RNA sequence: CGGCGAGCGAACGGGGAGCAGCCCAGAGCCUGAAUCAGUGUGUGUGUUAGUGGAAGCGUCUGGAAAGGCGCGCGAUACAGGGUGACAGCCCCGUACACAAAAAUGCACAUGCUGUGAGCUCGAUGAGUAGGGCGGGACACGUGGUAUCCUGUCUGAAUAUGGGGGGACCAUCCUCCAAGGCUAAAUACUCCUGACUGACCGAUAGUGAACCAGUACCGUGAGGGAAAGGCGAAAAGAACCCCGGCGAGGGGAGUGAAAAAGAACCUGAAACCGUGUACGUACAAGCAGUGGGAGCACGCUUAGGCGUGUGACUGCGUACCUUUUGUAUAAUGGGUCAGCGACUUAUAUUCUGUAGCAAGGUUAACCGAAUAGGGGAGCCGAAGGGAAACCGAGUCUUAACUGGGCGUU
RNA sequence: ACCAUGCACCGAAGCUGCGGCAGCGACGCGCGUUGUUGGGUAGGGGAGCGUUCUGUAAGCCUGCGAAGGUGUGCUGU
RNA sequence: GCAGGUGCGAAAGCAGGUCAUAGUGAUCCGGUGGUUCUGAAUGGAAGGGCCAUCGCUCAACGGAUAAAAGGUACUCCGGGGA
């Protein structure tokens, strides 16, 4: 049968043009106030998958 | 030429791997399993994105985003599709019927992507600056 | 596409079992003794063609001693001194002399002898 | 490219892209392996340790015995067990894409010319649906084994013609790459010969 | 949707197969008028027995010819089966052409018969819709949750009215619940016929090729085997002999063959004998291997050689598995034969190969079509952004000297 | 026996010699030349043998003896 | 180092916390504010997104559940001379 997309993956990684996959930092959904203006905006926009983990990643979205 | 007399490319019909089958094989007496554990096992093997009880990569980082309704139903035309639409004109409805886009798209973009040589007039999609700058050195018109 | 083995199985079984004849017991009649006998005479048979070499040089050497002594010489002043007359003999050949021509030989160690003095 | 009547004595003009083609070795191959695998019926099974009629009870208890641990009479190691990986029916039919069954039959028709295989007649018919009548047509014209294909499918010629074995009689529309091959002559009506040259562009 | 885990997983819309619409909740008027059921009768096809159905001889081998060789003949019949080895022409069939007293399927047709058409006026499903509580169903786990069903408590409008459009409201659109019937495309195969297989071929294939759901086991539910082949034909061995008026055997006879004799085709291996050659009763161990005398038999040069044996002598602790490491006194195997373990389907990526190429390719289906049709779709030629959106750029930011992802 | 000095010799599948096979690279037309390499578990890569079945095959072999069984000789890594 | 705005200094300049190295908790699910980015016929709205921020001695501190102690000499299986 059809593989089935791990669904959460889906929602935490997006191709882009030459197939990596972008994906938002993690450590910015709370306790904010003790870390510091610099690390928080280091943080706030995507990054792309390591080589390590892109294989992982594949794995969970056949039909990126 | 005979029905005994015709083979297949070179390359093009490599054999099978056959594993368990002795020790000339190569694959003999653990059929490139190596040895004992999980993975060894028939039916054996961990599921997609499992790291050992780790917090895996799609969990440890965030969700994001929402998926938009609208995109889905919205287009993008090359200038090479301009040509392809039979009648002169481009609009939603001859794109349609020249197979340029999806049956239940609403919305339409000409951008520039490949070339365009003819006249022709474009009505009620968007046109992005360039394309409308190749669209009219063509000779055609962009209608809203 | 069913295949029946016993055509192939008894094939094989029979090559090793003819491999094993004139061995002992179940090593000549049991499969699953045989095959091993045989392996291990193909292992035996692998060291003993360098092994062999080995026997045969010892053996030629032990010869042209007993010659050499007969003649009044040690087999390593012999050899030192043949080797020092630019005689080229090898010690197959040298422990053949030995045995069948005594005269021959004599004259080989009456070489050695002068050119080691 | 001008294809020469027997009976007639006339050209033919035809298409060099049909008729007059390089042999493409492997493309013909893969065509008529995919005719081969396509006859197939694939019409068999056998039992998996599930299917074999039996019970499921423990053939003797799991410890104490002395011998060798049980747990099925019907598995695949047993005799009258089960077969490990039991077949079942299967469609063995391949595609093939319909540029590269075209391209296949254009090759063949072009080595067939070449090889002096292919015969183009005017008209290639028989009075009556009599076998002996094809028989001695076939004598005439020093053909035994061949491959008749006519522009339309006739009711006296295919009459005489089946129970000759070494004959077959075809609609142009109604070719294969086997049949093609398997003849040792191929003979075609210039209707034919259109026909087929509609049909391969 | 989802301890947003594992997993679950639509719809809208498009291409196809098939297509069919109608009654009651009632009175006129008309009437019986389509349909519709039984039931006739015919009329056609089937079905259930059947009939005819072409064309060959000689010679060779052989137990036997259908085989070889030679020369013929039929074929709308060279499907298939049989016959002393392999038969178009010997036989049964096969193509083709025919056939029913009787019963029966279907399809027409018009007779009896009930169900009653078209028509105007009118009517338009209430403890119901909806709600509160508890559950369940919807891809949808109560969530912001529409919609469906209802165990419990309630409870309307009713056409100027009502339901739905995914919380909810307004506006618009669309439909008419609380009555019912309805062919086809769809599912299956205990059973019957015909035909087919890169399905099995006696440990396989059904458990069962054979008097098998039997023998046998179990109180019972239930479990559940093994076991096929003489020969072309029984011509299955008259008769004689040893033997217990035995068993068994030796002859004789049949047969191509009885070393095909029924304990029967072929007749492997483990295992057990008889015969011959050589070795072996002062000799220590994985039994071989390297060297090697002697003996016996045999070879076209008369020479050594070939075959078998193997005194004596160098070296030498099986195999598998598992281990850091096994002669290990760790595992497993009494031996032989037969069987016994990386498959299959679908999706996805990469490599090779082939076709076509900024294009490639069709699915279901249609079609007698492995053709042809069918482009619904899918993938690719554009990316960026959460998204609106912009677009060879885009996002970030008030803005980049910029930076991320892209563009060549 | 031990110390010291020295020259001989024995000694491995190390090295050399002779014959042969194969991998890889450089250089010339699958051939050659030349350099070099070839212990191996897990394991990866490459290339093959044989078995049953389908086509080729209404062909070819076969009662002047098929398959199977049992010997013998030749032959390839 | 660049843009904006700022403090101290006459000025050159210094300042994106503290002499430095511990003082900490992913994701999910939600809460609060801001922002038409989205808004299932349409206008709104709900919900969602985005930005800021809040709720863990999840301390077994890469946190398996929102939620969990014992007995077996009545014992049982698969394994290890690891
Ligand atoms: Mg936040
Ligand atoms: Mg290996
Ligand atoms: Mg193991
Ligand atoms: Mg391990
Ligand atoms: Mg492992
Ligand atoms: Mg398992
Ligand atoms: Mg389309
Ligand atoms: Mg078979
Ligand atoms: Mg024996
Ligand atoms: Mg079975
Ligand atoms: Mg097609
Ligand atoms: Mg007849
Ligand atoms: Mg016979
Ligand atoms: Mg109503
Ligand atoms: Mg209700
Ligand atoms: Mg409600
Ligand atoms: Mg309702
Ligand atoms: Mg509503
Ligand atoms: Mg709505
Ligand atoms: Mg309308
Ligand atoms: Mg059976
Ligand atoms: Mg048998
Ligand atoms: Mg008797
Ligand atoms: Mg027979
Ligand atoms: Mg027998
Ligand atoms: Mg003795
Ligand atoms: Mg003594
Ligand atoms: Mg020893
Ligand atoms: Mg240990
Ligand atoms: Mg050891
Ligand atoms: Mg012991
Ligand atoms: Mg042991
Ligand atoms: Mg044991
Ligand atoms: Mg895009
Ligand atoms: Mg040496
Ligand atoms: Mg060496
Ligand atoms: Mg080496
Ligand atoms: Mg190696
Ligand atoms: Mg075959
Ligand atoms: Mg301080
Ligand atoms: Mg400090
Ligand atoms: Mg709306
Ligand atoms: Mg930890
Ligand atoms: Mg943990
Ligand atoms: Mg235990
Ligand atoms: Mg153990
Ligand atoms: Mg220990």
């Known amino acids: 049968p059809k593989i089935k997309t791990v669904r959460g993956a889906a929602k935490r990684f997006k191709k882009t043009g030459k197939g990596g996959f972008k994906h938002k930092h993690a450590n910015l959904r709370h306790i904010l106030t003790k870390k510091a203006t610099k690390r928080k905006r280091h943080l706030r926009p995507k990054a792309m998958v390591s080589k390590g983990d892109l294989g992982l990643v594949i794995a969970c979205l056949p039909y990126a | 030429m005979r029905l005994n007399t015709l083979s297949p490319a070179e390359g093009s019909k490599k054999a099978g791997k056959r594993l368990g089958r002795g020790i000339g094989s190569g694959l003999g007496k653990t059929g490139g399993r190596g040895h004992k554990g999980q993975k060894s096992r028939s039916g054996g093997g961990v599921r997609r994105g499992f790291e050992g009880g780790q917090m895996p990569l799609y969990r440890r980082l965030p969700k994001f985003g929402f998926t938009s309704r609208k995109a889905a139903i919205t287009a993008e035309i090359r200038l090479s599709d301009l040509a392809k639409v039979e009648g002169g004109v481009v609009d939603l409805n001859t794109l349609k019927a020249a197979n340029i886009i999806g049956i239940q798209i609403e919305f339409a973009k000409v951008i520039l992507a490949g070339e365009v040589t003819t006249p022709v007039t474009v009505r009620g999609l968007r046109v992005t600056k360039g394309a409308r700058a190749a669209i009219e050195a063509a000779g055609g018109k962009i209608e809203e | ?117 | 490219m001008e294809l020469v009547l027997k009976d007639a004595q006339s050209a033919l003009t035809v298409s060099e892209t049909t008729f007059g083609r390089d042999f493409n070795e492997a493309l013909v191959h893969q065509v008529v392996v995919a005719y081969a695998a396509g006859a197939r019926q694939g019409t068999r099974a056998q039992k998996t340790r599930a299917e074999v009629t039996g019970s499921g009870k423990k053939p003797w208890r799991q410890k104490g015995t002395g011998r060798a641990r049980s747990g099925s009479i019907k598995s695949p190691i047993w005799r009258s067990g089960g077969v490990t990986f039991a077949a079942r029916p299967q469609d063995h039919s391949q595609k093939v894409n319909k540029k590269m069954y075209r391209g296949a039959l254009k090759s063949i028709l072009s080595e067939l010319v070449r090889q002096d295989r292919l015969i183009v007649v005017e008209k290639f018919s028989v009075e009556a649906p009599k076998t002996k009548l094809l028989a001695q047509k076939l004598k005439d014209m020093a053909l035994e084994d061949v491959l008749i294909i006519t522009g339309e499918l006739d009711e006296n010629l295919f009459l005489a013609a089946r129970n000759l074995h070494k004959v077959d009689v075809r609609d142009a529309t109604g070719i294969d790459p086997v049949s093609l091959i398997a003849f040792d002559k191929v003979v075609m009506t210039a209707d034919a010969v259109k026909q087929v040259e509609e049909m391969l562009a």
């Open chain 3, 1 to 117: 596409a069913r295949v029946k083995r016993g055509v192939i199985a008894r094939a094989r079984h029979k090559k090793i079992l003819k491999q094993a004849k004139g061995y002992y017991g179940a090593r000549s009649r049991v499969y699953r003794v045989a095959f091993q006998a045989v392996i291990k005479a193909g292992q035996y048979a692998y060291r003993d063609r360098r092994q062999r070499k080995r026997q045969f040089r010892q053996l030629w050497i032990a010869r042209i001693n007993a010659a050499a002594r007969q003649n009044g010489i040690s087999y390593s002043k012999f050899i030192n001194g043949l080797k020092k007359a630019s005689v080229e003999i090898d010690r197959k050949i040298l422990a053949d002399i030995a045995v069948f021509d005594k005269v021959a030989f004599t004259a080989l160690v009456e070489k050695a002898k002068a050119a080691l003095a």
